[PDB]
């Protein structure tokens, strides 16, 4: 019918006017006989309008249409290993998403699709519905009931060409597995399209190093059953006859460094060939292409094979490629701290020519010092450049300090508060502090300590040291008597080589002894000097002050710190008296640790842990007791308490007491978990132990004094063994252990849940 | 080794500075006494110095009334001995200690003999 | 101070019989003794420490026996002249040393 002007009505989401150009007419005449087909096939290609029915009064066209109402929350009910996340994914494939109208007939293909990915995973028996709720506004929900059904296992792997030679229990190398020991448990038999990817090539590499060149695939061949519970996989393929190689030549430019790819190439005529073997040559040649300044050459292994005796000649080839350099270097990670910083451990350097392992080098001092989360270097190469070469070291960085406190657990300390914080990048600097200031509302005792690694160029370090404290606890005449002292320390430290260091330095100290108990093996050392004050008196009381000189050496060599996997670092320190002092005697004492994985795949790794102190004077001058070792406490000795180890005490009944002679060890099992994702699992640290350690003393004997037992052995052993997970906070480093012992020797202590704070070691 | 000074004569009351000398051994430590020996038979520890001159013990009849000091710089051992009496008459040793154990002499002293008298 | 008992008194003997000198000690502490010797007219030497033990350059002779309580000095098969007189000496109470009344030695001819 003729019309004039064009209504709409019930459009309360999108205009009229557009709603009025998806239909072309011409209007003011009598429009065209499209507009019933334009007002369908757009205002539902759309999407967005559910019915439409148009009519003419005689001058004016009155549409009346709705709109498809839209999707407002989409929602998921039976998700059992799976994440919305991907679902939207999925979704968002469909074409649908929040905020969208719809036919609600596409539902059967939605359906379709979700069980086409639950294919995808291993599942073929489920079944998903949608769940409409209509809502006003022209809105919608819905929800998704899935019935996941279940997943199949594995029943046979046979194969077709296997012949002269079984593999059909070798093939427990792969990933996949055709039987589930009941007593090895952790997975089952599941397929999986991509390990099947990687294990026939992992199988194909086995045998193409046990002497074939032929063994070849025909096909691969899968099924499953009707209930969908378990496959049933076969393998077509050729199992050849063997082979072997003979001789080995190249081809290419070099510099005339044949003479040492001469090296790497050696061999033996008439060996098995093989495949890996091959690679890392190529790949080691690779490297000392990096030394010499090369990145892109192209290495070619080509078999010249004589079957008619089943031997082969390797062609090879090579392309050396043009020579490179470089032109400039990037950094990224730099937050908080300063560049130049991390350059004086490049070993690589700017604007020359180059190796691919001073790279390395640069990677390693890096992954060292544990100043970061992570690490990551690239390589680019500049634009217009046939031999210029760029590159980057990015790194994240991290929050690396810490704030210790002990808190004399297990009584070391006894009832105090030592607080303090450590801190080695300090401000982004490489400055590197450490302070505890330590109160009981009677005693003090604060100590700062500082060095710059780099004070001077080339790795110069240098340090200082000074601590005052009072120690007041004979307030009411009880043990553990009262000193005062305080005093300094000096240092220099530089290596000389790129992985060994030496230390060493000077300290003065000022001590003030007062209400000594009448404790009686201590004043063996006090009669060494002279003096011999109690029947069991106390008014004893005595000073002295002494300059010192200590030395250290070092050894480190990890992968990296901060939570290594490998190498190992050991630090020994030696101090000394010296001349015009109080007194003459010098100790050593060493840390030792090492890092061995398996392959640092799946993280199954090892340590070995170990300490030693020691200590004798000359001149009748040997140490001081205060001086003494101690042990127990859970950070050297897990599953005992604080300076709890060894002899007890002696008046005229029993505390540990210290002494000269130590030796101590702990042998591990490192592990990962799998209960938590790597997100955070990366920055966590697990491990079990068994724990031994001993102490005793040379000079004290028991021929004489004998109502007591000695103490002079190196046996009469402590042991105990257990757990402890150690786990990063922003509040420094955490670590908690529960263990057992089971072997003491009367008269000792511990706990078993025990937690510690700090620098943990 | 050890030279020591003289006895005399002393009217009591008065008082009187001995001395003792150390001559090879280190010195600078070994607790020294001086211990009197009556011809009565009667043996009298009555001053003890330790290590140094730090710890100083003395016996239940002066009651502190001497002082004892020493210079290791001299190797020399200083008694002054203020009020005296008849009694305190009595031949007089500087002694030496043991090292590494301690508790008892190593070297015993000439042996001085004091006498007060009108 | 404290009662640092020497008994018995001066004695005398012949070359080679055996001789225990008692020094008995009134609060029954073991190893608190030292035993010297003094010559007549000579300086007084040391002769055991630790109540038992026998100091370096003397014959084997020489023996500290007997408790806290009790303690005697043994000479084995003694020889030509060793004619002293020997005392004891505490150091259990440090403040108070006490020495023996000495125990003067005479001869048998």
């Known amino acids: 019918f003729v019309v004039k002007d064009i209504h709409f009505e019930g459009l309360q989401r999108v205009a009229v006017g557009a709603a009025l150009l998806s239909m072309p007419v011409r209007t003011g005449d009598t429009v065209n006989d499209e507009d019933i087909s334009n007002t369908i096939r757009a205002l539902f290609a759309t999407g967005n309008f559910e019915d439409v029915r148009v009519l003419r009064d005689g001058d004016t066209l009155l549409v009346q249409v709705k709109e498809r109402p839209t999707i407002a929350s989409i929602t998921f009910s039976g998700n059992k290993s799976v994440k919305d996340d991907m679902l939207k994914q999925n979704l968002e494939a469909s074409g649908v998403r929040v905020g969208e109208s719809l036919d609600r007939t596409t539902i059967a293909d939605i359906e379709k699709g979700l069980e086409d990915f639950y294919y995808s995973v291993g599942k073929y028996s489920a079944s998903v519905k949608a769940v409409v709720t209509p809502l006003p506004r022209n809105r919608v929900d819905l929800k998704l009931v899935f019935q996941e059904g279940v997943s199949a296992e594995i029943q046979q792997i046979n194969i077709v060409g296997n012949h002269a030679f079984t593999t059909d229990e070798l093939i427990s190398h792969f990933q996949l597995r055709d039987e589930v020991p009941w007593w090895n448990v952790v997975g089952d038999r599941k397929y999986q399209k991509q390990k099947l990817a990687g294990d026939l090539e992992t199988l194909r590499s086995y045998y193409l190093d046990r002497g074939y060149a032929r063994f070849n695939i025909d096909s691969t061949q899968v099924s499953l059953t009707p209930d969908k519970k378990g496959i049933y996989v076969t393998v077509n393929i050729t199992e050849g006859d063997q082979y072997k190689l003979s001789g080995v030549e190249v081809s290419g430019n070099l510099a005339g460094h044949s003479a040492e790819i001469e090296q790497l190439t050696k061999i033996e005529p008439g060996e098995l060939y093989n495949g890996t073997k091959v690679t890392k040559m190529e790949d080691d040649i690779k490297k000392l292409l990096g030394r010499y300044g090369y990145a892109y050459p192209r290495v070619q292994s080509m078999p010249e094979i004589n079957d008619a005796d089943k031997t082969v000649k390797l062609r090879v080839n090579v392309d050396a490629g043009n020579r490179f350099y470089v032109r400039k270097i990037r950094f990224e990670g730099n937050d908080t701290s300063k560049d130049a910083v991390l350059r004086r451990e490049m070993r690589q350097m700017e604007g020359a020519w180059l190796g691919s392992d001073l790279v390395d080098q640069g990677k390693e001092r890096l992954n060292r010092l544990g100043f970061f989360e992570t690490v990551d270097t690239d390589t680019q190469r500049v634009p217009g450049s046939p031999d210029q070469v760029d590159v980057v070291y990015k790194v994240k960085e991290r929050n690396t300090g810490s704030f210790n406190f002990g808190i004399g657990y297990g009584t070391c300390s006894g009832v105090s508060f030592q607080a303090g914080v450590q801190q080695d990048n300090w401000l982004g600097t490489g400055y590197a502090v450490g302070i505890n200031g330590t109160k009981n509302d009677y005693q003090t005792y604060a100590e700062l300590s500082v060095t710059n690694p780099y004070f001077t160029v080339d790795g110069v370090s240098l340090g200082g040291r000074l601590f005052y404290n009072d120690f007041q606890a004979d307030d009411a005449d009880l043990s553990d008597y009262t000193n005062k002292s305080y005093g300094t320390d000096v240092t220099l430290g530089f290596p000389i080589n790129e992985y060994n260091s030496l230390r060493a330095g000077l300290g003065y100290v000022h001590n003030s002894l007062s209400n000594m108990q009448p404790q009686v093996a201590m004043w063996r050392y006090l009669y060494s000097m002279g003096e011999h004050p109690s029947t069991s008196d106390q008014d004893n009381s005595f000073k002295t002050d002494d300059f010192t000189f200590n030395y250290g050496w070092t050894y480190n060599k990890l992968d990296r710190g901060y939570f290594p996997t490998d190498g190992s670092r050991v630090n020994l320190t030696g101090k000394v008296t010296i001349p015009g002092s109080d007194n003459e005697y010098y100790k050593v004492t060493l840390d030792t640790a090492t890092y061995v994985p398996i392959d640092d795949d799946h993280k199954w790794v090892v340590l070995g842990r170990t300490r030693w102190g020691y200590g004798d004077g000359l001149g009748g001058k040997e140490m001081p007791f205060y001086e003494n070792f101690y042990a127990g406490g859970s950070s050297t000795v897990r599953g005992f308490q604080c300076n709890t180890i060894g002899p007890k005490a002696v008046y005229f009944s029993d505390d540990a007491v210290g002494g000269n002679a130590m030796a101590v060890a702990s042998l591990e099992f490192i592990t990962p978990t799998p209960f938590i994702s790597d997100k955070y699992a990366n920055s966590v640290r697990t491990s079990f132990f068994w724990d031994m350690g001993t102490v005793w003393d040379t000079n004290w004997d028991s021929s004489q004094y004998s109502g007591y037992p000695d103490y002079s052995d190196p046996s009469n052993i402590r042991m105990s063994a257990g757990i402890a997970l150690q786990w990063m906070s922003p509040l420094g480093p955490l670590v908690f252990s529960y263990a057992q012992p089971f072997k003491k020797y009367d008269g000792d202590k511990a706990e078993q849940f025990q937690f510690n704070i700090g620098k943990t070691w | 080794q050890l030279v020591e000074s003289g006895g005399g004569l002393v009217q009591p009351g008065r008082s009187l500075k001995l001395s003792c000398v150390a001559s090879?051994?280190?010195?600078?430590?070994?607790?020294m006494n001086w211990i009197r020996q009556t011809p009565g038979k009667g043996l009298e520890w009555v001053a003890y110095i330790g290590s140094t001159s730090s710890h100083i013990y003395y016996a239940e009849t002066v009651k502190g009334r001497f002082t004892i000091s020493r210079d290791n710089a001299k190797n020399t051992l200083y008694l002054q001995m203020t009020g005296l009496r008849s009694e305190d008459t009595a031949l007089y040793y500087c002694?030496?200690?043991?090292?590494?154990?301690?508790?008892?002499?190593?070297?015993w002293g000439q042996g001085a003999m004091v006498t007060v008298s009108s | 101070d404290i009662q640092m008992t020497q008994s018995p008194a001066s004695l005398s003997a012949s070359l080679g019989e055996t001789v225990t000198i008692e020094c008995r000690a009134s609060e029954d502490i073991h190893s608190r003794l030292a035993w010297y010797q003094q010559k007549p007219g000579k300086s007084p030497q040391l002769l055991i420490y630790?109540?038992?033990s026998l100091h370096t350059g003397v014959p084997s002779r020489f023996s500290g026996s007997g408790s806290g309580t009790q303690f005697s000095l043994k000479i084995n098969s003694l020889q030509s002249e060793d004619v002293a007189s020997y005392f004891c000496?505490?150091?259990?109470?440090?403040?108070?040393?006490?020495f023996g009344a000495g125990a003067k030695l005479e001869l048998r001819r």
């Open positions: 090879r051994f280190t010195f600078s430590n070994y607790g």
């Open positions: 630790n109540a038992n």
């Open positions: 002694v030496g200690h043991v090292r590494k154990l301690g508790a008892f002499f190593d070297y």
């Open positions: 000496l505490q150091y259990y109470n440090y403040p108070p040393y006490t």
